[PDB]
Amino acid sequence: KKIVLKSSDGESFEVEEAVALESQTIAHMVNGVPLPNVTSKILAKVIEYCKRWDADFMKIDQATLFELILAANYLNIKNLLDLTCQTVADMIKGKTPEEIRTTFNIKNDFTPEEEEEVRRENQWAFE
Amino acid sequence: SSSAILDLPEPLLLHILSFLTDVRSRHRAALACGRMRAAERATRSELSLRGDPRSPGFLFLSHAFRFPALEHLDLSLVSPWGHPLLSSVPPHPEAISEQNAFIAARLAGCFPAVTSLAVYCRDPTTLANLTPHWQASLRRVKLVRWHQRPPTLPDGADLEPLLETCAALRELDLSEFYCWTEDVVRALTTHPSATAALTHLDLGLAAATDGFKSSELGPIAASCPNLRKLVAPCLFNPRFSDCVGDDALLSLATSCPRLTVLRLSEPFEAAQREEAAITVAGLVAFFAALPALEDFTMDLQHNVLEAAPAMEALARRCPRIKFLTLGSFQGLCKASWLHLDGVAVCGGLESLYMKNCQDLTDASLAAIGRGCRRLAKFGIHGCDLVTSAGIRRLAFTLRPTLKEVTVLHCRLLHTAECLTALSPIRDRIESLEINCVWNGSWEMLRSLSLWFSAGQLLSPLISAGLDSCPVLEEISIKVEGDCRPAPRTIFGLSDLAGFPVLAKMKLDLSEAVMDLSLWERFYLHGIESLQTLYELDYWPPQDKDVHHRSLTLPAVGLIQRCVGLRKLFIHGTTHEHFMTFFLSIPNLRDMQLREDYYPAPENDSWLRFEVQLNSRQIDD
């Protein structure tokens, strides 16, 4: 028995019931499954992951990564969410505050005095 | 246009930050923006407190310095290092009590959810002042004391505040806590309500004890029916009638039937051929009584002869046995018969360390390679019959799994031949520990531990086989012997300059022995040529007479030029006048004098240097 999943683009995907059970959002749904929050491009990647290294699977551009985080969370796939979130953490590791800002296109919202307050707080922990 | 990471639902940003474990990175993330500061503070799981929590700087930090999810709080490294923290003992009784209550309340403010605590603990009133805020959640406590036990305390008084108030306590780590064996026995036998629930016990006592006797271990075990992990030093010398023999081991097993980790060791002086009171039949009965055992260490100086049938019993009776360390067990694997024997029968072994097995041969290693097909870690220490042919065969057989090798003080295994014999796993070995004896990359080698005799040079290591180590990130160097060399001869630290990612060094001269100045110069010379050196732990040598271990001026001059240092820990002391020289290291952040050896000097200026260190504009 094989179950059908619908993306936001309209397109449909046929998957094994073992594969779709990996999403706890899908498992809760009791013709076929509409997923208005997941595009075809991203749903294909989810399905590919749900076939049961993944270091290769994570060799994607930044936009796709964050869309995959949103999908993994909208569906309830703990392992994919963990992998995608660990990958973002690895991007943060080893970067200066400016390099972090540049990578994720973050605006510095700190006052000069707030910045020094954070710095002074950080001093209370060994590195 | 906008930031995708900041457009994520805040719970997902928190989830991301929960995977960042490098502290400096967490700090940098908190500096990126307001939203990441909040996420970092909300997800930090552990913290080692830096500075003086008694100061206004700590006590009047804002509401924003708050770590709601923090589980592990380490207080053992607060400044000044090793001083009494929140003690009631006078160094006005109501002024002390009030200031202690405030500091404790502020610690609970910053760290509400603590389940695991490490604390430097000079006397028990420290514990009485810290526990009341976390007594509901405190599961694990680690105590540190390298100083003398206060002479006037009653037996067991060090542990009483923990045992009276902390109902959630499960794990007690006294590995680095100097007290008497009597203290442990008295506390742990007279607090049945606390003690019945304990699952983990480390009884190392700062390695400053002759070991627990039979009359001490018996009652401790009897009072701890729920133990899963026991680490203890024991008296195994059969010349004392209270030593640990067959009966004591069996009592241990039947009193603690749920043990999965059991590490017992014999403390020794340099000032060994006699047999232990432990027999093969005794061990057979012992293993039968421990069916859940996974991790077993028995590291003796006294011999257990013809040990093979006990290892066969271990395999049968403890089917989950994975990690095995044995010292002075003889005949562990003879390889004399058609069938595999002794330790070669233990098919589930993932690590094996054998010390002072005088009849272990190349044939033994060949057998071990075939029998123990899951071996990821292998060590031999003082096994004098093993040759490079045996190592080569072992490394070849265990090529699919073998990642960590230790070869120490094996007479027929000099360094050049030993490194050559490891050629079958040269591209796969992640960690290597060897002592150096003098006459195509190490692709995965991340970690290297070296042992030297006093005056011996490091330089020949490169041509002996370790010339290309592209991922080597940490090196540990320990020097043994009596110092009491041509003037341009140096140890040769600068010959490590060819290692491109070497970031972390332990240089331990504590047992290497004015004259000490020239030795420090000999060892430290060229340290500035290590361009990626980031973290240095340096243990100065002892002088036979004096209580302090001094970092002399030549050593200061040498370390000062290590431009890349972020972290510098000196396991000893230095003159106040030498301190400012370290400030010229441009990005140095963490620096501390840690006198973490027994007995620690009772100290009678660091705090002012510490403000000077924090005031510089170093990189984030």
Side-chain angles (χ1 to χ4, degrees), chain A residues 85-126:
Chain A
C85 289
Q86 174 68 87
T87 309
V88 183
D90 290 341
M91 285 169 165
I92 297 153
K93 181 186 193 198
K95 304 232 212 309
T96 67
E98 282 288 349
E99 289 166 356
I100 291 159
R101 244 113 63 180
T102 299
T103 302
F104 295 106
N105 199 236
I106 291 167
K107 188 155 71 179
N108 191 350
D109 59 357
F110 286 133
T111 294
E113 79 223 56
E114 289 180 307
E115 201 152 72
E116 216 55 54
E117 191 48 62
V118 179
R119 217 172 257 117
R120 208 179 300 126
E121 289 177 351
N122 289 344
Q123 286 180 333
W124 288 98
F126 279 104

Side-chain angles (χ1 to χ4, degrees), chain B residues 533-545:
Chain B
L533 186 67
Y534 187 85
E535 173 171 16
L536 178 61
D537 273 86
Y538 177 69
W539 303 67
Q542 286 170 289
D543 200 288
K544 287 168 186 151
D545 295 300

Side-chain angles (χ1 to χ4, degrees), chain A residues 47-86:
Chain A
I47 289 156
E48 188 177 28
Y49 177 86
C50 285
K51 310 294 277 183
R52 295 279 161 96
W53 223 269
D54 56 36
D56 272 6
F57 181 72
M58 288 301 84
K59 283 153 62 67
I60 47 170
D61 85 303
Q62 212 187 100
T64 305
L65 176 59
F66 285 108
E67 288 179 318
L68 204 55
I69 296 170
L70 289 165
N73 183 253
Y74 166 69
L75 311 172
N76 200 5
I77 317 156
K78 194 215 139 104
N79 298 349
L80 181 64
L81 192 58
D82 285 7
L83 169 73
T84 55
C85 289
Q86 174 68 87

Side-chain angles (χ1 to χ4, degrees), chain B residues 335-450:
Chain B
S336 292
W337 298 280
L338 212 60
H339 294 95
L340 297 178
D341 79 294
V343 91
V345 156
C346 304
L349 291 191
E350 289 166 26
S351 82
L352 174 64
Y353 188 23
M354 296 171 288
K355 308 179 63 178
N356 180 36
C357 184
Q358 274 150 36
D359 60 351
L360 200 81
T361 59
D362 295 340
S364 310
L365 295 212
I368 289 162
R370 286 306 171 189
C372 311
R373 284 185 284 116
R374 291 184 211 172
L375 263 193
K377 310 174 179 175
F378 182 84
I380 48 168
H381 186 305
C383 296
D384 290 330
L385 298 182
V386 184
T387 78
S388 67
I391 296 293
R392 181 170 22 266
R393 171 67 59 200
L394 186 73
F396 193 78
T397 313
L398 293 178
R399 178 157 217 280
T401 54
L402 189 53
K403 294 304 215 152
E404 310 200 352
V405 179
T406 307
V407 178
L408 291 173
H409 308 285
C410 294
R411 258 191 18 106
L412 306 171
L413 284 163
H414 297 345
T415 308
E417 288 85 342
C418 191
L419 299 169
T420 297
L422 294 175
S423 149
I425 55 160
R426 191 189 267 230
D427 65 320
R428 294 199 174 160
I429 189 170
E430 297 178 6
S431 164
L432 177 63
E433 175 161 18
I434 46 147
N435 70 297
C436 300
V437 185
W438 312 136
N439 219 48
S441 296
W442 300 83
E443 296 284 16
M444 296 286 291
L445 189 68
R446 294 184 75 213
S447 182
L448 179 61
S449 305
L450 304 166

